[PDB]
Design a protein around this ligand. Structure first.
Ligand SMILES: *[C@@H]1O[C@H](CO)[C@@H](O[C@@H]2O[C@H](CO)[C@@H](O)[C@H](O[C@@H]3O[C@H](CO[C@H]4O[C@H](CO)[C@@H](O)[C@H](O)[C@@H]4O)[C@@H](O)[C@H](O[C@H]4O[C@H](CO)[C@@H](O)[C@H](O)[C@@H]4O)[C@@H]3O)[C@H]2NC(C)=O)[C@H](O)[C@H]1NC(C)=O
Ligand SMILES: *[C@@H]1O[C@H](CO)[C@@H](O[C@@H]2O[C@H](CO)[C@@H](O[C@@H]3O[C@H](CO[C@H]4O[C@H](CO)[C@@H](O)[C@H](O)[C@@H]4O)[C@@H](O)[C@H](O[C@H]4O[C@H](CO)[C@@H](O)[C@H](O)[C@@H]4O)[C@@H]3O)[C@H](O)[C@H]2NC(C)=O)[C@H](O)[C@H]1NC(C)=O
Ligand SMILES: *[C@@H]1O[C@H](CO)[C@@H](O[C@@H]2O[C@H](CO)[C@@H](O)[C@H](O)[C@H]2NC(C)=O)[C@H](O)[C@H]1NC(C)=O
Ligand SMILES: *[C@@H]1O[C@H](CO)[C@@H](O[C@@H]2O[C@H](CO)[C@@H](O)[C@H](O)[C@H]2NC(C)=O)[C@H](O)[C@H]1NC(C)=O
Ligand SMILES: CC(=O)N[C@@H]1[C@@H](O)[C@@H](O)[C@@H](CO)O[C@@H]1O
Ligand SMILES: CC(=O)N[C@@H]1[C@@H](O)[C@@H](O)[C@@H](CO)O[C@@H]1O
Ligand SMILES: CC(=O)N[C@@H]1[C@@H](O)[C@@H](O)[C@@H](CO)O[C@@H]1O
Ligand SMILES: CC(=O)N[C@@H]1[C@@H](O)[C@@H](O)[C@@H](CO)O[C@@H]1O
Ligand SMILES: CC(=O)N[C@@H]1[C@@H](O)[C@@H](O)[C@@H](CO)O[C@@H]1O
Ligand SMILES: *[C@@H]1O[C@H](CO)[C@@H](O)[C@H](O)[C@H]1NC(C)=O
Ligand SMILES: *[C@@H]1O[C@H](CO)[C@@H](O)[C@H](O)[C@H]1NC(C)=O
Ligand SMILES: *[C@@H]1O[C@H](CO)[C@@H](O)[C@H](O)[C@H]1NC(C)=O
Ligand SMILES: *[C@@H]1O[C@H](CO)[C@@H](O)[C@H](O)[C@H]1NC(C)=O
Ligand SMILES: *[C@H]1O[C@H](CO)[C@H](O)[C@H](O)[C@H]1NC(C)=O
Ligand SMILES: *[C@H]1O[C@H](CO)[C@H](O)[C@H](O)[C@H]1NC(C)=O
Ligand SMILES: *[C@H]1O[C@H](CO)[C@H](O)[C@H](O)[C@H]1NC(C)=O
Ligand SMILES: *[C@H]1O[C@H](CO)[C@H](O)[C@H](O)[C@H]1NC(C)=O
Ligand SMILES: [Ca+2]
Ligand SMILES: [Ca+2]
Ligand SMILES: [Ca+2]
Ligand SMILES: [Ca+2]
Ligand SMILES: [Ca+2]
Ligand SMILES: [Ca+2]
Ligand SMILES: [Ca+2]
Ligand SMILES: [Ca+2]
Ligand SMILES: [Ca+2]
Ligand SMILES: [Ca+2]
Ligand SMILES: [Ca+2]
Ligand SMILES: [Ca+2]
Ligand SMILES: [Ca+2]
Ligand SMILES: [Ca+2]
Ligand SMILES: [Ca+2]
Ligand SMILES: [Ca+2]
Lengths: 148, 5, 105, 1167
């Protein structure tokens, strides 16, 4: 089932190459992307890009929430004003809109922000595969391996 | 029988 | 909240009938009236018994005037007691038949 | 402490204020004033209150016997007031002036000379036995006269002694009062006393007039009938049935059951509008509530009494339970009572009954010797109710409480067949179907009614238009609409704690506990039958319908479902082959589909995806249609006899039943794919299906084995409910809360049982004709969602169809002729695989409705599409009327041939009745029959039976009271002559009962006699499982199944111990749970080489293999060669001798245990 769904489920990409998706059809219970990839239908309009083109979330209608406790980020969402600018990505968007709303803020080192994003994380959650940042240094193009 | 009238 | 066995039975059966709540309340009041009727009936039956005790004493005495007076009292009292008894019986029949009809419909 | 009587006893205070003199001096009841008795209670002469049902029950309850004061009619007893005398041997009474006037007076003729008694007109021994007053010349012996106010004292024969003249029936018109022995006939306001005995309307009112139906048309005439005028002609071949009026609105209302409408007009006849025109199929009668401006209507297609505003708004039903055949109606808003007659209830009894104007507190007003009560009117000033009987041929009267029963006419020579009745001043007016005339008679007593108007048609509905006929009174609902949310309906003046009105609400709503506010209905029992589609409450107490009963004229309803969001119900009229939808309130009827419908047996609705499924018994297929765009497709094609179907929107399944011999219950995805049997063992006729939404369990019911079963949606965990007492052919079922509601064909009823076990059978409805599917309407049930109805993306992103699929998914679908493209979500047209089609073949005419009808039906004069298109714009030079019709010759109208020369002008141009010849000739009524004046022939014995069998009154013409009949006829005493065929036929026909009295009901051939001698019944009804005799004697002693055994013709399943017919053994289908019925001992059947052998084990011609027909009844003859042309025609008990491991069965009466090695005794009884 995992064939042609923008996910390298086989590691080598054999299940995600376009050469097989030229003849594969999505399951009757699956949503089909504009490009042709196949996605489980619960991913249709669930605030995540899954089709690559984000065509699984094109044309959807989302409820605009109350000004009391909502921050609406680019894909459309509703999370508390308290939740933004903190250590947890609540507006999971394309581009870190949950904490990117605080560009010049300060988190001290050893509790360091993710480089150019005010999400505050310790010195070593890097080169490990956990999505510890939606920007900059999640796997750190300069330093890693605890560096002593 | 069982037919409907 | 009832005191006579017959009205308790009738209420217990009428609980399971197809009565509207309005008809249930009216039936409750009707059972209270029927209870008053049966209490009147048993009271006057006991009065009939006490008059019978007086009549037994008088008849043992044998005084013709005492016998005549106790007869005037007793036969009329028995007439009235029977009058109440037949009314109680009819009311019981009516209520029981209505409850039984309202249990099946 | 207690109250002390003069006797010297401290009498209990409760004995004061109790109507009973509880001590010798009566002081306990000397002062205390008592409370009044309400409308539902009867006032005794001492003011005591008793229940209304105690009146005329046969028992003295007021200790004055006032509640039994003459409940029986014709109680002459030779007493019949002074100044009167009776003819011995009959009891008939005649006044003194008429006796020895020279002509016989009583039917005996004892009032004149006769030699049997030796009596001659003359003054006898009264010359010696003189009284204080005049003696008289009675032939039997001198009696003597009495002055007013005095009877002749029976002890004296000489002294007249006081009584009251004011109580004599007919002494004064209206109220009377006696002044020291002198009776004064006071007249109520608005009346002027005349002649000292009669009261006439004051000229303050605009004279008076009589409005009546002569048959077709509505006429009006003066009281001294000389100036009749047509108030309204019946359009479109209608007939005016029942009429009433509103004086202060200048309005006259009437009903029309041929056109199925209710109309209104002014007395000038100008402003005409139709009041009601939906669900009024048979408006038998009508009544106007002038105080509250509401119209009370009687309907008889679905027996009910409806109350509606004038101009036809705010419909609400008052009385439905036990209504039988309701005909007459009348009301007195000044007091709050509603009277209506019934010539036979669902319980059988015909009766005249009374209720509050809101329908509460019903009471049998008259029940003895009632017969066929046909009309009711009220004497408002005298507080008496008048009603007529068309079977025992009388007109009688009782008070509002039913005390003073008096008869005003009696016998077939006077009132052979009264239908309507109206009252005014000194006279009473009534139609008669046998005399074909509107009759006029004295309100008290009379012997020869005068003809007021003579008609050639049967007349209906007399009423008298006057102001004094509708007295003024205050309206409790007149302020704030009584404070009710929607509707305010009057009641008795003492009802509702003295307010005198009760709040109700229109259809689709029910009252809040606030009892003035009302909210929407949440749930009710939807059921379908041949007559109508109805909705009743689940509670058995408030039986009145909660939705407008759906009805059609040729209709036959089977399938039902509902859409609670729009408050609509879907149904299929199997007589029309059309599927409709209609709102709860009765409006909004629309056609869902009418094309390619052969016989729709069941309906189900997916409320989340908005899809409608139905099973077709004629197409042997199930179709799904989306209401949003009217697209449809057949999703299962080759069933055998699909009957029921249910869809589970959240689980994504559907379940349908096929009852062909290898009966099975199948499950499929809501798409219609993945079709598979899930129950195919121990099934015969699985008529109904249901789903228990709380527990997610499928329920079905058998009509062959008569059992209710339920299981999980996979068919596992199968269980069987206990025996239901009289259930023997259950068709449909539904599950609501913890109960199961089932319709039974043989019972003709709806029964309710617990869903946990066998339950306690409760008969919700009974005697309900050709009953069909039952469904539980439920607004709460239809709340939910799936991937087909998410708010963010509509319809599951599918193009036309989206179907729920198990495991919380969706599958797209396409209409006919269209395929799912690469996307699997968008539909593209594919005429190659599924070519587009036309409405129907070349041989027939497609309507403008989607339905198709034969070309012969076009322009035949009758609408055959039910959306009139075969008669629309016919008759043009080039569009001929069908040769079965007749064209109105100036052009543009094609009437049916049956309407030509039928004494009624249908054509716009009257050509249908123009130039009609004469057709009598030698009509040759045979010598075995009577010939009517209209040249019809009827059996000779129907003459003088008080019935217009000739349809012109001829067979009852010249029917004087002759005292003889035809020699073949039986004579009812003083009533009529009757055919001997009706004598001892089963029910009563003569008033005295002689025709059905004393006779013995010795049964005919093929009939069974009940143990009590109640009646005879067919032998087919003996030993059936249903109680037919009243003593249950038809099912007593019937053969039973021996304990744990099966009948000698029933094979026993070794897995569970149930029984199947012996022919089901060795048939190739495992009917038992473990297949005990297909053991190795069953030989195979080998097919002669001229036939193919089906997968189901049957023989079919070699030529019919893959020929395009389901000849094998499982498509095996097709699917064995789908290669098709691509061109055109142009050992506990027993042991056996198996080859391998032993398969030892057990003996009968035992259950083979799951090990397959041991068995257990199956009987309840102990070893
Ligand atoms: C009456 O109703 C019953 C169901 O109550 C039907 O029986 C079922 O028929 C179905 C055919 O569509 C099957 O799903 C099912 O039979 C098999 O299920 C097997 C599952 O495997 C396990 O269980 C079997 C039980 O026999 C066991 O033997 C095995 O070792 C496993 O533990 C499948 O393997 C099996 O496949 C076989 O048949 C298919 C074709 O159907 C072939 O393609 C395969 O090669 C293989 O030979 C099969 O699916 C049935 N279940 C039962 C209860 O038997 C009847 O068909 C209905 N009959 C009628 C007259 O309506
Ligand atoms: C119930 O209660 C109502 C009042 O609430 C009574 O209605 C009254 O009825 C009487 C007749 O019985 C009416 O009197 C007549 O009125 C005529 C004029 O009516 C017009 O104007 C009134 C308003 O004033 C309108 O309502 C009505 O529609 C008309 O437009 C007069 O012309 C009449 O007089 C003529 O005839 C009389 C003889 O009948 C002669 O003596 C006169 O010389 C003249 O020729 C007459 O006066 C009265 O108007 C009505 N009241 C109202 C306010 O309308 C019901 O009668 C009553 N019903 C019962 C049974 O109790
Ligand atoms: C029943 O009565 C109403 C009139 O009260 C009819 O309603 C009309 O229906 C037609 C369509 O059939 C509309 O074009 C009219 O505008 C409607 N008029 C009103 C006042 O709403 C209705 O058709 C009648 N139905 C029958 C069966 O006679
Ligand atoms: C033959 O009969 C038909 C049915 O009356 C007539 O059909 C007409 O067709 C036109 C469209 O071409 C419609 O607009 C009209 O409503 C139809 N009816 C009539 C009476 O005109 C047809 O006209 C008839 N033949 C002729 C030549 O009149
Ligand atoms: C239209 C059509 O048949 N499409 C097919 C479908 O049926 C199925 O085989 C699918 C598997 O991924 O791929 C493709
Ligand atoms: C005169 C009269 O009827 N008076 C009242 C009546 O209005 C009503 O209250 C009735 C209830 O039983 O009891 C009494
Ligand atoms: C007499 C005759 O045949 N008249 C015909 C009739 O038969 C039918 O064809 C009709 C249209 O349906 O028009 C015309
Ligand atoms: C004695 C007898 O039969 N008399 C006559 C009979 O002949 C016939 O006239 C009948 C009415 O049809 O009434 C009577
Ligand atoms: C019962 C049974 O087996 N019947 C027989 C079969 O055995 C075989 O002879 C067949 C030949 O056409 O005809 C048949
Ligand atoms: C919050 O939401 C509600 C709807 O649930 C809305 O009616 C209300 O206006 C909102 N509050 C404010 C502050 O607008
Ligand atoms: C969404 O995602 C990609 C990064 O993964 C980014 O390059 C692209 O511009 C984004 N689109 C928007 C408008 O955020
Ligand atoms: C007639 O006779 C009976 C019996 O004697 C008596 O009770 C009754 O009062 C008498 N009638 C009159 C009016 O005296
Ligand atoms: C019924 O009874 C009568 C005698 O009472 C007899 O003459 C008649 O033939 C019987 N009829 C039938 C049909 O059994
Ligand atoms: C024509 O018939 C086909 C079946 O042969 C389908 O029912 C189709 O929907 C029909 N269409 C019309 C317009 O009648
Ligand atoms: C009408 O007259 C015709 C002859 O023109 C026949 O005689 C027919 O029998 C007559 N019928 C009547 C009732 O007069
Ligand atoms: C009809 O039958 C009666 C009775 O037999 C007469 O024979 C009459 O002459 C018949 N007339 C016709 C036309 O058949
Ligand atoms: C019913 O009939 C069977 C024989 O068919 C037996 O007599 C059995 O005992 C009967 N059952 C009852 C309860 O009488
Ligand atoms: Ca993949
Ligand atoms: Ca997504
Ligand atoms: Ca955050
Ligand atoms: Ca990381
Ligand atoms: Ca007292
Ligand atoms: Ca009584
Ligand atoms: Ca005479
Ligand atoms: Ca009659
Ligand atoms: Ca059966
Ligand atoms: Ca036609
Ligand atoms: Ca005609
Ligand atoms: Ca007749
Ligand atoms: Ca009879
Ligand atoms: Ca029976
Ligand atoms: Ca079998
Ligand atoms: Ca075939």
């Amino acid at each position: 089932d995992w064939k042609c769904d923008n996910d390298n489920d086989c590691g080598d990409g054999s299940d995600e190459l376009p050469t097989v998706c030229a003849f594969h059809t999505c399951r009757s219970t699956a949503f089909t992307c504009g490009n042709g990839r196949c996605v489980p239908y619960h991913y249709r309009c669930d605030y995540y890009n899954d089709c690559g083109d984000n065509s699984d979330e094109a044309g959807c209608l989302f409820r605009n929430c109350n000004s009391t406790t909502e921050f609406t980020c680019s894909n459309g969402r509703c999370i508390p004003l308290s939740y933004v600018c903190n250590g947890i990505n609540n507006c999971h968007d394309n581009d870190t809109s949950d904490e990117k709303n605080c560009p010049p803020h300060t988190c001290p080192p050893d509790f360091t922000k993710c480089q150019t994003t005010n999400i505050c994380v310790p010195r070593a959650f890097l080169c490990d595969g956990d999505n510890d940042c939606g920007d900059g240094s999640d796997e750190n193009p300069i330093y890693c391996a605890s560096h002593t | 029988x069982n037919x409907x009238x | 909240e009832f005191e006579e066995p017959r009205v308790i039975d009738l209420w217990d059966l009428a609980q399971s009938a197809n009565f509207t709540e309005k008809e249930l309340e009216s039936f409750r009041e009707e059972l209270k009236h029927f209870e008053a009727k049966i209490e009147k009936h048993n009271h006057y039956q006991k009065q009939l018994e006490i008059s019978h005790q007086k009549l037994k004493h008088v008849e043992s005495i044998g005084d013709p005037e005492h016998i005549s007076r106790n007869k005037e009292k007793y036969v009329l009292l028995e007439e009235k007691t029977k009058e109440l008894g037949y009314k109680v019986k009819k009311h019981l029949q009516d209520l029981s038949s209505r409850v039984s009809r309202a249990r099946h419909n």
